[PDB]
């Protein structure tokens, strides 16, 4: 209850969700999938992103992302460029994902002032 998390959408082809901020609730959804099929929990509707393309979670209080076996692959950004994760790769916050070819987002982390 003293953070909310979301994805932030930095470059997407919907134009209704590029620039958006969309909240995850890992109270309710443990693992939070993302892919271009509406069962995903955040759906990404990209040609080029894969039906079910990823999932992001919460392990021991830290960040993850794994791609499941997705055709234009899962990236995060080093500074300089991306690189392929890796199998169980940990995330800190604001860090910027590649999603197959065309969608591009950002990890958020914000404190909520819990008031205990």
């Not at 969700?17 to 909240?23: G, I, Y």
């Not at 939070?32 to 039906?51: A, C, F, K, T, Y």
């Not at 999932?55 to 990236?75: A, K, P, R």
């Not at 950004?77 to 994760?85: A, H, L, M, V």
Request: hydrophobic letters at 35%; charged letters at 20%.
């Amino acid at each position: 209850p003293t953070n909310r998390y979301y994805i932030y959408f930095i470059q997407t082809p919907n134009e209704n969700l590029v620039n958006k901020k969309v909240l995850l609730n890992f109270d309710l959804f443990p693992s939070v999938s993302m892919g271009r099929s509406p069962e995903n929990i955040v759906i990404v509707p990209d040609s080029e992103v894969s039906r079910k393309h990823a999932v992001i979670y919460l392990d021991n209080s830290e960040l993850y992302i794994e791609d499941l076996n997705s055709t234009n692959g899962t990236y995060v950004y080093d500074g300089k460029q991306f690189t392929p994760i890796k199998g169980k790769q940990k995330i800190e916050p604001n860090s910027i994902i590649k999603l197959g070819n065309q969608t591009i987002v950002r990890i958020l982390k914000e404190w909520s002032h819990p008031q205990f």
